[PDB]
Design a binder for this molecule. Sequence first.
Ligand SMILES: O[C@@H]1[C@@H](O)[C@H](O[C@@H]2CCNC[C@H]2O)OC[C@H]1O
Length: 302
Amino acid sequence: AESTLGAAAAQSGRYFGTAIASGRLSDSTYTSIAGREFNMVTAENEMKIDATEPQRGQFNFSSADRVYNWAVQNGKQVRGHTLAWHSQQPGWMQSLSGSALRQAMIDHINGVMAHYKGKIVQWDVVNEAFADGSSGARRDSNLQRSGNDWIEVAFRTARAADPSAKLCYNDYNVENWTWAKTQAMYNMVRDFKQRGVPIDCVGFQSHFNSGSPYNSNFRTTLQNFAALGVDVAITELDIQGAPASTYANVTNDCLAVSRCLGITVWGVRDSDSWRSEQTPLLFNNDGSKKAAYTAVLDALNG
Ligand SMILES: O[C@@H]1[C@@H](O)[C@H](O[C@@H]2CCNC[C@H]2O)OC[C@H]1O
């Protein structure tokens, strides 16, 4: 048994990660708790399209490198998030459509992956391409309006740019095996594997709440995607109210699936959360451990 989340996960060959915000790297409580507890880092915002390419052709890795360098200095690996997404696009990309947008999407993947070549274990190459609800349709965005092949082209571009990186598709509301959105993602990955589209991993954001609740069939979802020949990862876990029971269920689901690489929670303290009002993380505002922290650590330790 180990006394910290990352070390506990590492005993079964897994990681335990968090999202890191560069502007908070001067906060001593934040940096010391995150340093101690996690062995994997995702940049919360700094590796997104707008942050990394604020003007077309003009990259800015200053804040991204602050996160990457903090991670490596503190003994963590890094998940890159995210190369192609409808949200947080810079204005210049929002205005593009069609073939011009396709070229800009490819150029953006190539430039960011070149900067980090060989240094990023997993990339969320494409994020949030499915619509919510019963349709299983693609989300409407400039990217999707450029053609159904946007996702496959992003993945082929990424495979050529950095053959060492594991290439992930990441989404939310895709954890419950019975949901239409989950099945749409399953059918896409299955099709990609049939047609030779490079995809190595699927990320399950795991933003659980009353409208999108945890279900024990998450373990079935994880198993069934692993059986397609991809790794699986829990990428942005948070749980409304932070119940200990659900936090332990999720942890045990990952521990039960050989190709589940690890778990990232989407922040450190409740006050760091994008959904702080839902008190959905493992640490209190003062940095003390919540009941859910103990439940996770115990589950990791068997
Ligand atoms: O700071 C906020 C981030 O936490 C938020 O991150 C997204 C959560 C949902 N899945 C994708 C993540 O990038 O993005 C908005 C930002 O304001």
